[PDB]
RNA sequence: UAAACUCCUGAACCCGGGACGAAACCCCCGAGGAGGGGACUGACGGUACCGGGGUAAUAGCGCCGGCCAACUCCGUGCCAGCAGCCGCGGUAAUACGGAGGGCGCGAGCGUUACCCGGAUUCACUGGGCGUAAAGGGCGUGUAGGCGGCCUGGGGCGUCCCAUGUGA
RNA sequence: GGAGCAAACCGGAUUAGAUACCCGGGUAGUCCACGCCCUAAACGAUGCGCGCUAGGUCUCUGGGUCUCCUGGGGGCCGAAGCUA
Ligand SMILES: [Mg+2]
Ligand SMILES: [Mg+2]
Ligand SMILES: [Mg+2]
Ligand SMILES: [Mg+2]
Ligand SMILES: [Mg+2]
């Protein structure tokens with residue numbers, strides 16, 4: 018029962034004798050506004066239906082987000098082949114400065130202070146996957162010494 | 169100066185009850201209580217989800233219209249905050265509250281903020297002795313925001329002070345209702361304030 | 377103080393004068409890499425004791441002639457013709473660039 | 476003839492770790508020991524020692540790894556998330572004390588050759604010295 | 614490229630040419646009309662646009678578009694050049710300022726008088 | 738709530754008062770020195786400012802199809818016009834023109850001009866080259882650039898402290 | 905130097921036309937010697953060198969007591985990884 022908000026909804030189509038049939042797509046993101054967040058992309062022959070699907074996929078997928086009084090723990094360069102995105106911790110009272118896409122993501126991640134920017138490609142779809150796989154790479158102080166401990 | 173134009177009108181656009189007025193805004197009629205929808209031939213129609221921009225915009229406009237102050241000066245203070253250290257967001261609000269014509273409102277001397285500008289401008293008010301008429305003037309901590317001698321026995325001054333009996337106000341403030349004067353104890357913590365505006369969005373907007 | 381440069385002789389073909397090549401190195405103002413450039417100075421040598429290829433020291437001095445405001449200080453080492461080569465070879469290459 | 480022994484060395488680790496090897500060798504050298512010395516001081520490798528290869532001095536660098544992982548494709552965690560040389564043979568990078576970088580907000584380390592030894596980012600800063608930024612690790 | 618290649622060759626500095634030879638920096642340039650005539654728009658359109666060649670003080674000679682509805686420019690009307698091309702018309706890279714010199718403003722226009730040089734009326 | 742209407746304050750305007758900026762050089766005691774005392778001099782200006790009386794007392798401009806905050810009606814009918822781009826207008830235009838309403842900013846609001854930004858679109862930080870623009874037709878080798886393992890001397894680079902300079 | 909082939913060129917056919925595809929004939933050229941030209945889808949459309957990172961299969965070539973180990977080439981499938 019986390020918070021929910023879509024990113025965008027396109028209307029791809031297919032060619033075929035006589036005419037062209039469509040299939041709408043919708044990107045959506047979920048989060049409690051505190052570490053728990055997930056993204057989902059759902060395709061379906063109709064608008065509200067495609068959202069409904071995205072809903073299940075979004076709540077399906079999910080990732081823990083090591084917060085820090087509203088900010089992230091450290092910066093990360095994450096290249097999803099085509100696109101590239103970089104995050105960077107900010108002192109409280111800064112804000113969530115980013116693109117339309119990575120804004121919603123981090124916003125539902127309970128974030129309130131972060132420096133970011135998109136490079137190379139800017140495809141909203143690809144940018145999404147980049148931000149997700151970015152947070153998934155985040156590592157708290159504990160997580161580091163935990164793996165480096167190995168005792 | 170401030171937009172003299174209809175003000176109970178804005179309450180409707182913002183979608184939030186706004187006490188630009190005084191007695192009437194508190195009565196069953198801030199304008200919004202009768203028409204909870206925005207102005208315009210429309211407004212009574214199904215709106216659409218605003219862009220991240222529209223939202224960050226409609227949030228800033230709220231805070232600006234509240235203090236009913238020039239966009240120029242407003243933006244100047246937002247920057248003023250970014251200049252200094254500390255949490256920019258709250259501090260911005262802190263300087264808005266430190267404004268003189270504002271304190272007169274938060275000290276009860278006036279029923280309205282725009283009315284507060286009136287008195288202050290006409291020099292009815294005073295600080296430590298000087299008849300400061302600059303609605304601007306950043307009120308430093310520890311200052312006598314008294315009332316000028318000639319202005320002490322004013323008709324509209326009394327009605328305000330009489331109704332301002334008892335009633336706790338401004339934790340960061342004090343008020344000598346007898347001698348007609350108050351004090352700016354300290355800078356108002358974000359926790360001490362409470363406004364319909366989310367400062368975090370207002371910062372994001374001036375990030376552009 | 378009077379600037380001083382370690383550099384090698386590369387032209388003893390003058391009267392009471394000798395040309396000295398001096399190489400300096402420093403980080404690129406932008407790319408940081410260590411680049412190496414140089415310049416030739418004419419040094420006053422009334423004794424003519426300093427022959428070709430002699431690595432010597434030079435000093436900012438009273439103006440002697442039009443293009444010559446330095447004097448020799450002291451030899452550092454004799455056999456250094458390999459370095460004079462690098463200079464003379466560079467010259468030979470110039471001849472094979474024009475038309 | 477190679478160029479920078481250090482570069483290929485760090486490469487050996489990177490290449491090996493990605494395939495999850497027990498350990499790998501690398502020609503012996505004072506400087507490489509120092510690298511691994513600090514590379515173990517902060518704990519990135521299990522250790523090392525002078526090993527032979529048909530009369531040739533090498534160095535066994537026993538790699539370190541994370542726990543096994545659940546979910547699709549059980550990829551072990553990497554103790555060496557990333558490693559890369561900074562001061563290359565093409566461009567010599569020298570930094571002053573109050574210039575030394577902070578590798579991923581402290582979570583990382585910046586091995587660099589000081590005029591008084593070989594130190595980490597925090598360690599060099601502490602002693603109050605600068606030197607050739609060899610590389611970073613995190 | 615290598616660092617060396619950069620050290621030697623270096624990065625080529627970008628340089629852009631001005632889409633408008635109005636002057637050396639002048640916001641506007643005065644010039645007298647010569648020809649004044651309606652020309653057809655390009656590919657997707659057709660609407661006989663009011664344009665005019667104008668021999669500049671700067672010895673030049675260029676065509677400029679006349680905005681708004683109608684005008685009063687003849688074979689000797691002076692005028693100002695604003696400068697702003699028109700995708701619909703080839704070769705026209707300059708606009709003409711209304712309400713200045715022999716260039717009269719637009720009559721009967723209510724909205725956006727500034728752009729079309731019309732003094733604000735009085736309803737009374 | 739906008740106006741109408743009631744109340745309150747009171748810019749402007751009038752009366753009176755009215756500067757700081759000036760303390761020396763210059764006069765005595767002493768010694769024309771040190772140290773104390775004494776007198777002229779204000780263009781700005783009867784302005785600033787202080788006190789008394791005192792009338793509700795200018796609003797404009799851009800924009801509202803998407804980017805981009807802000808919607809409908811009428812006229813028009815690829816015409817008249819719009820435009821920064823994508824584009825709009827060939828009877829039903831939120832894209833043209835007028836109106837109502839709205840959004841933005843207010844003694845300013847818009848346009849043109851040039852500069853940096855966005856442009857990681859000259860890329861040191863921070864790009865590329867199988868087919869997208871891009872590997873020299875292939876060699877040989879000159880300059881230059883780059884260079885393996887161990888010990889030692891100098892200390893050119895590099896790093897550190899002090900000091901001068903950095904008005 | 906000149907057999908065969910063959911731009912240009914001549915003729916037959918085809919076609920509305922047919923400077924072309926198809927047929928008959930035919931020149932420079934192709935060939936050699938010396939000299940010059942210096943281009944190309946001069947293509948792996950992939951600069952050269954060094955070090956790293958699973959294997960499976962067939963093939964050329966070399967050394968070794970040898971149902972296979974080892975070094976150098978040429979191919980196909982494919983770990984991780986890269987990739988629009
Ligand atoms: Mg069809
Ligand atoms: Mg890429
Ligand atoms: Mg929270
Ligand atoms: Mg784009
Ligand atoms: Mg994680």
Ligand SMILES: [Mg+2]
Pocket residue numbers: 081083155156157160
């Ligand atoms: Mg984590």
Ligand SMILES: [Mg+2]
Pocket residue numbers: 163166167168
């Ligand atoms: Mg453990």
Ligand SMILES: [Mg+2]
Pocket residue numbers: none
């Ligand atoms: Mg208005």
Ligand SMILES: [Mg+2]
Pocket residue numbers: 205206207208209210211212
């Ligand atoms: Mg309404």
Ligand SMILES: [Mg+2]
Pocket residue numbers: 249250251252253254255256
């Ligand atoms: Mg701040």
Ligand SMILES: [Mg+2]
Pocket residue numbers: 358359360361362
């Ligand atoms: Mg609170």
Ligand SMILES: [Mg+2]
Pocket residue numbers: 388389390391392393424
């Ligand atoms: Mg001589």
Ligand SMILES: [Mg+2]
Pocket residue numbers: 414415
């Ligand atoms: Mg030179």
Ligand SMILES: [Mg+2]
Pocket residue numbers: 440441442443
């Ligand atoms: Mg001379």
Ligand SMILES: [Mg+2]
Pocket residue numbers: 440441442
């Ligand atoms: Mg001389």
Ligand SMILES: [Mg+2]
Pocket residue numbers: 427430454455
């Ligand atoms: Mg000698």
Ligand SMILES: [Mg+2]
Pocket residue numbers: 522523524
């Ligand atoms: Mg050991």
Ligand SMILES: [Mg+2]
Pocket residue numbers: 647648649650688
């Ligand atoms: Mg004419």
Ligand SMILES: [Mg+2]
Pocket residue numbers: 684685
């Ligand atoms: Mg006329």
Ligand SMILES: [Mg+2]
Pocket residue numbers: 732733734
């Ligand atoms: Mg007027």
Ligand SMILES: [Mg+2]
Pocket residue numbers: none
């Ligand atoms: Mg009112």
